[PDB]
């Protein structure tokens, strides 16, 4: 899974 914000 990858991060969900910049």
């Amino acid at each position, epitope marked *: 899974t*990858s*991060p*969900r*914000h*910049l």
Partner: antibody, heavy 113, light 108 residues
């Protein structure tokens, strides 16, 4: 940790550009790279992203086909290619990574004759 | 896609007040919502992610809360350094979408 983006570009209508952003502080293969733009005096538009260790890519419907996101893992940079540039596409294009990293400095693209 | 309805678009309030910007979601996005601050005129900086998890370096007067489809960014003790436009961003599914933005002005 910082991202540097290519200089402000001037390009003719209907042409194509390839914007870049290099990373110094982390590895490109270690996170996802995202592009967002901001038209003058407007909000934020999310363009797309490229998965770490390429890796698939995802895009926004209004940039589907007219935008391709790629990375040069050796150079530790990321690219955004835009085609059929119209006067609507003049904006400030930000490049950033997933996580707590800062955003790119920003590249202003101007589409004009 | 998932649309973020940020409100108000512009808000003016006196120094020291408490501010609440709200961001309603068209679908359920759980807690995958973030907040950004863009002072005039530089790059957007992350304030809050995961609806409520503060980011190191952001003043304590910023707080976030919400789940599902309702979210609120709270700014207590309004300081002049908070003059900026604020955006909410969801990351539950692609394409990621931002809110319309909230222009915050000080009523001196």
């Amino acid at each position: 940790v910082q991202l540097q983006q290519s200089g402000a570009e001037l390009v003719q209508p209907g042409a194509s550009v390839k914007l870049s952003c290099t990373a110094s502080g982390f590895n490109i293969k270690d996170t996802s790279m995202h592009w967002v733009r901001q038209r003058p005096e407007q909000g934020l538009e999310w363009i797309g992203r490229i998965a770490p260790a390429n890796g698939n890519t995802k895009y926004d419907p209004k940039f589907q086909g007219k935008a391709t996101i790629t990375t040069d893992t050796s150079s530790n940079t990321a690219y955004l290619q835009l085609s059929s540039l119209t006067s609507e596409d003049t904006a400030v294009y930000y490049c950033s990574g997933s996580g707590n990293y800062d955003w790119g400095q920003g590249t202003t693209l101007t589409v004009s004759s | 896609d998932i649309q973020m309805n940020q409100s108000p678009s512009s808000l003016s309030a006196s120094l020291g007040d408490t501010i609440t910007i709200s961001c309603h979601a068209s679908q359920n996005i759980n807690v995958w919502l973030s907040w950004y601050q863009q002072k005039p005129g530089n790059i957007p900086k992350l304030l809050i992610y995961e609806a409520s998890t503060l980011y190191t370096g952001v003043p304590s007067r910023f707080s976030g809360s919400g789940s599902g489809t309702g979210f609120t960014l709270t700014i207590s003790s309004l300081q002049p350094e908070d003059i900026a436009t604020y955006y909410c961003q969801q990351g539950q599914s692609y394409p990621w979408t931002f809110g319309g933005g909230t222009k915050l002005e000080i009523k001196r």
